[PDB]
Design a binder for these strands. Structure first.
Ligand SMILES: Nc1nc2c(ncn2[C@@H]2O[C@H](COP(=O)(O)OP(=O)(O)OP(=O)(O)O)[C@@H](O)[C@H]2O)c(=O)[nH]1
Length: 1073
RNA sequence: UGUGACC
């Protein structure tokens, strides 16, 4: 509830010269008071009359009404930022050392020195690409500095540490003035020219870093990173986070968690001695020297200190540095440089080929339907991303231009041009338009924006491999419904005094030109074997067209822009843009380690406890017959690196007996760690989401970081949200959304009023507002309807249908239509219409709901019904689980020490339902969890027509539709769909064991009725309420349920008429994918 | 229509 208040201290801070609180109430007479108070307030302000009287006069509204929004009327020239910044600029501005970076443009020169003219300029290399200004990030900081000016004791040491650092920014910024941004939140030439090219993005990186400073060690790390990061823009992060790969092999294991047969974490009190060959210490020092030579001082000592004893208890510092290294910003080079960096393989290609076979064998041998109708599968899965060229399109009586695949597939069909039989060339004659991938730390990488013919030809076969992966443990990233905790235990499992883990980063190998041949070759070779396993025209064709793209790509040409020119150079490496990218890379990376391990066995004899490939890393745990020694480690480590060398693969390969470090995670001292390097004030690229959407994503990013071990002051986060979600009515009148508006479970939710706890409307006003917002959730788009009606479209939707369905089916059909209408949202013009509407709507909205004939039910209502039939009473749970994830805040860790954690993802798509399994045996169609949710609630005879109308044979449709499974499915679909709506797999909850016995105790639910659905929700709602209470108070409570029998049937009905809510908060979570 | 693949 503090938002609404911290919101005023802010406005009254930014503006000095008025605020007009706007309330509302579900109660008619109180609302009319809410209306009167409003106007009376406007009036007095329109006369410079103190509102003090009215605030007393209408004290009733203040007290019993819900704050809807705070109106801010300010008449300043909005340069108050410039003015306000002086006070903090009394330190010596930083002077960029233009010597630290290789490429010249990476050095912090003046903009003009890099770009002499306005036609040569480009923010392309610094663009914060986010929808909030640098002025704001500035205002935010100062606002907070003022509020914690007179704080005492420790808060002061936090204020101080912070005030200091801000100066560095403030002073440096003041020297060249503050860079003003345009309506699109971009920094142009006129403003950037005189100022250092990287002033802005660095300011942003530095602000976000200093506002995440608390302890002295923080401050030390910030300050250091903030200074060097003003000159170094290319090796800092890599330099700072490089040591961590070795630090993990130095901490002894004193009690760890392993994985048991039930594939779940189980404590193991074992001790494993970290065995390290001297050479490693050399390597680690060489890394410490490099750290120093590049200016670093404070950070290198922290590690050197740590290295005396190397206590897993004093490892939180090392982890902290590793996570901070990333907040320096992204490394955005020039496409050209990004692209320029570019007989013993016999074994390595044989394995790749054998792996491509295993995966597709059965599907091929048994003329799988998916492999046959793969062309339809690709079409239905086609996204509305780029195709490469910017074609002119004819829709109805309108010719517009677009690059969208969905737009090009359509147009192409309506003109006999749709020809997937012909897989376009990608050579010198038809160069690949390029894309990029920017990440903090590593150098930029290019990306092939291949023609849609390439997706379609690969979609189905890729999916068939991913399935083989789903149940092959070696593929960590894909195995079962597993989260990272599982992979954590699979390693710590076989560890001991006679084994050694071998990890390897191979990101450089996959881009290496050496790989590109044995890679594409092994796949093709494999595809051949498969082709010889059938005669099915369908299979051979799609199996063949796959072989085709694996050739056109062998000798590929790329379109690198080199200025305002687009040179065509020859690309001889495997870039990524295909559908097989992730799968193939997984296949390849694993084929590799197998190749390496196989070779080193000629000398040393060991056993393979586990082999794994996960993203751009690949590791294995070997076991020897004798106790391992420093010398044994050195030898293995050498023969390995040497084996990799004989393949001309530039890769980092380490060998330890206690931990590992890979891009996704690292295991130090038997504990699990995940880098907390998600940037907040700078983004990789510009999407299409709105500001609100970005507000929510900021917050989301805050939560993930926080859980990972990097906390940005929440007061700062809330300030940014106050900024980003606002809506300007005129040049002076700006409207600010209230806490109720932004946190309630609506279509406009941005964040949770309290971290790790998701509330739902439990009061009338809350219900009122919730139902009001939903009413204006989806907006009209003239442009979207125009094409939604055009011929090529209807024909498109039609052609897809007649191809999928056998008999009639209106649910599918009505779906395919919308499913395709939505894709148009990637088209900017439409997107823009939408947002404009949403604003005006949500504009008048924050003024008077009322008229909204609610009739739709949501998870809120369901819960709000159940709420009153429970009795809480103080309970208690002892801490009985040792911590394995050190970084977790304290209130979230607690829940785990009491009820435990999980290593799987709760099924929330209805994929395990029998009916869904059925449809996938005879159909290429994929129904959402929300469709199955309705299809399962249909009259027995309707479900039978659905099934048949998708190619499901009667002996099957008729058999299922009756069976007991249909009933169990009925429950399973609902059970799955509800979890989906409660976000049981996100943020905080995904961590918890919702089936913990310890938890089950606190839940006392007398089953006065044998009606599964109701029993279900009652227990879950209770498990949630218990855990929330524990997440806030630190103590536990028990729940007793006295839900009526009569009511149960009333509820069960409500259950099957639930609507899914769509919001920025929701999408934010989906973005964490 | 300052936009730039897979997932
Ligand atoms: N290209 C690529 N991007 C990835 C990969 N894995 C994750 N990402 C990125 O992941 C960001 C998502 O971060 P998350 O995966 O949601 O962080 P998290 O993994 O959900 O934290 P949890 O897994 O507990 O463990 C996106 O912006 C992606 O670009 C990958 O293997 N390849």
């Amino acid at each position: 509830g503090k938002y609404n208040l911290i919101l005023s201290e802010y406005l009254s801070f930014i503006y000095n010269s008025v605020q007009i609180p706007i309330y509302y109430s579900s109660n008619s007479e109180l609302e009319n008071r809410c209306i009167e108070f409003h106007s009376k307030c406007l009036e007095n302000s329109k006369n410079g009359l103190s509102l003090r009287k009215l605030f007393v006069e209408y004290n009733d509204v203040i007290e019993n009404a819900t704050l809807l929004s705070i109106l801010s009327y300010s008449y300043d020239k909005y340069n108050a930022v410039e003015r306000k910044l002086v006070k903090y600029a009394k330190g010596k501005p930083l002077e960029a050392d233009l010597t630290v970076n290789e490429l010249d443009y990476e050095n912090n020169k003046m903009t003009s020195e890099l770009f002499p003219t306005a036609e040569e300029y480009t923010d392309s290399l610094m663009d914060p690409a986010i929808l909030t200004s640098l002025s704001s990030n500035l205002n935010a900081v100062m606002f907070w500095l003022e509020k914690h000016e007179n704080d005492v004791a420790e808060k002061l040491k936090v204020y101080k540490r912070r005030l200091d650092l801000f100066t560095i920014v403030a002073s440096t910024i003041n020297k060249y003035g503050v860079p003003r941004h345009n309506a699109k939140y971009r920094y142009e030439y006129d403003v950037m020219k005189d100022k250092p090219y990287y002033l802005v993005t660095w300011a942003n990186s530095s602000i976000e870093m200093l506002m995440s400073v608390f302890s002295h060690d923080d401050y030390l790390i910030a300050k250091e990173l903030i200074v060097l990061s003003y000159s170094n823009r290319s090796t800092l992060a890599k330099l700072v986070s490089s040591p961590m790969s070795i630090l993990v092999a130095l901490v002894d294991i004193n009690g760890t968690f392993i994985t048991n047969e039930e594939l779940e974490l189980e404590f193991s009190n074992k001790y494993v001695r970290a065995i390290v060959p001297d050479q490693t210490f050399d390597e680690l020092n060489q890394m410490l020297d490099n750290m120093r030579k590049a200016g670093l001082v404070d950070i290198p000592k922290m590690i050197q200190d740590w290295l005396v004893d190397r206590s897993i208890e004093k490892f939180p510092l090392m982890a902290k540095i590793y996570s901070w290294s990333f907040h320096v910003g992204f490394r955005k080079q020039k496409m050209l440089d990004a692209a320029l960096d570019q007989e013993m393989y016999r074994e390595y290609t044989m394995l790749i080929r054998d792996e491509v076979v295993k995966m597709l064998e059965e599907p091929v041998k048994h003329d799988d339907h998916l492999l046959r109708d793969s062309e339809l599968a690709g079409l239905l899965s086609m996204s509305s991303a780029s195709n490469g060229e910017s074609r002119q399109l004819k829709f109805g009586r309108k010719t517009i231009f677009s690059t969208k695949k969905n737009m090009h597939v359509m147009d192409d069909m309506a003109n006999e041009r749709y020809t997937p039989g012909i897989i376009p060339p990608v050579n010198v004659d038809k160069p690949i338009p390029l894309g990029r991938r920017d990440v903090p730390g590593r150098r930029t990488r290019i990306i092939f924006i291949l023609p849609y013919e390439y997706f379609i030809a690969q979609h189905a076969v890729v999916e068939k491999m991913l399935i083989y992966a789903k149940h092959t443990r070696e593929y960590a990233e894909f195995y079962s419904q597993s989260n990272q905790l599982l992979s954590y235990g699979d390693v710590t499992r076989f560890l001991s005094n006679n084994t050694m883990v071998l990890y390897t980063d191979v990101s450089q190998w996959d881009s290496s030109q050496h790989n590109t041949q044995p890679f594409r070759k092994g796949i093709i070779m494999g595809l051949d074997i498969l082709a010889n396993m059938t005669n099915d025209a369908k299979v051979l064709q799609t199996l063949n067209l796959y072989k085709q793209t694996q050739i056109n790509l062998m000798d590929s040409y790329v379109q690198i822009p080199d200025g305002n020119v687009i040179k065509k150079i020859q690309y001889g490496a495997v870039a990524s843009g295909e559908k097989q990218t992730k799968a193939a890379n997984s296949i390849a990376n694993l084929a590799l380690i197998k190749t390496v391990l196989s070779r080193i066995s000629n000398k040393h004899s060991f056993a393979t406890k586990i082999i794994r490939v996960d993203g751009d890393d690949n590791y294995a745990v070997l076991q020897f017959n004798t106790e391992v020694t420093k010398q044994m480690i050195q030898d293995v480590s050498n023969d390995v690196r040497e084996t990799y060398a004989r393949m001309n693969a530039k890769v980092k390969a380490l060998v330890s007996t206690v931990g590992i470090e890979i891009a996704k995670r690292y295991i130090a001292g038997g504990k699990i760690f995940f880098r907390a390097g998600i940037n907040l004030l700078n983004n990789e690229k510009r999407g299409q989401s709105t500001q609100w959407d970005q507000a929510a994503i900021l917050y989301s990013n805050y939560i993930v970081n926080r859980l990972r071990g990097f906390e940005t002051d929440r007061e700062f986060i809330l300030t940014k949200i106050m900024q980003m979600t606002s809506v300007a009515i005129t040049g002076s009148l700006r409207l600010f959304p209230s806490e109720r508006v932004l946190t309630t479970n609506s279509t406009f939710k941005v964040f949770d009023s309290e971290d790790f706890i998701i509330e739902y409307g439990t009061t009338v006003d809350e219900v009122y507002i919730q139902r009001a917002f939903m009413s204006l959730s989806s907006q009209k788009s003239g442009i979207a309807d125009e094409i939604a009606a055009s011929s090529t479209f209807k024909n498109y939707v039609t052609r897809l249908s007649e191809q999928l369905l056998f008999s009639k089916n209106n649910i599918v059909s009505r779906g395919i239509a919308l499913t395709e209408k939505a894709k148009l949202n990637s088209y900017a013009p439409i997107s823009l219409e939408k947002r404009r509407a949403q604003i005006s709507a949500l504009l008048t909205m924050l003024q008077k709901p009322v008229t909204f004939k609610s009739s739709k039910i949501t998870i809120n209502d369901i819960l709000r019904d159940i709420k009153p039939f429970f009795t809480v009473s103080d309970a208690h749970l002892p801490i009985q689980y040792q911590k394995f994830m050190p970084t977790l805040p304290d209130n979230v860790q607690y829940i785990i020490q009491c009820i435990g954690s999980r290593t799987y993802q709760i099924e929330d798509d209805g994929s395990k339902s029998a009916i869904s399994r059925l449809i996938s045996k005879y159909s290429v169609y994929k129904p959402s969890i929300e469709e199955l949710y309705k299809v399962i609630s249909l009259h027995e005879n309707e479900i039978q027509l659905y099934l048949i109308s998708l190619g499901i044979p009667k002996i099957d449709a008729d058999t299922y539709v009756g069976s007991k499974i249909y009933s169990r499915d009925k429950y399973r679909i609902l059970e799955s769909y509800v979890y989906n709506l409660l976000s049981i797999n996100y943020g905080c909850y995904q961590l918890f064991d919702f089936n913990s016995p310890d938890l089950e105790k606190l839940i006392r639910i007398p089953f006065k009725g044998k009606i599964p659905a109701v029993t279900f929700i009652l227990h879950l709602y209770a498990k949630l309420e218990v855990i929330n209470y524990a997440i806030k108070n630190g103590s536990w409570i028990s729940l007793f349920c006295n839900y009526p029998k009569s009511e149960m049937i009333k509820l069960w009905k409500k259950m099957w008429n639930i609507t899914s809510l769509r919001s920025p908060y929701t999408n934010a979570n989906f973005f964490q994918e």
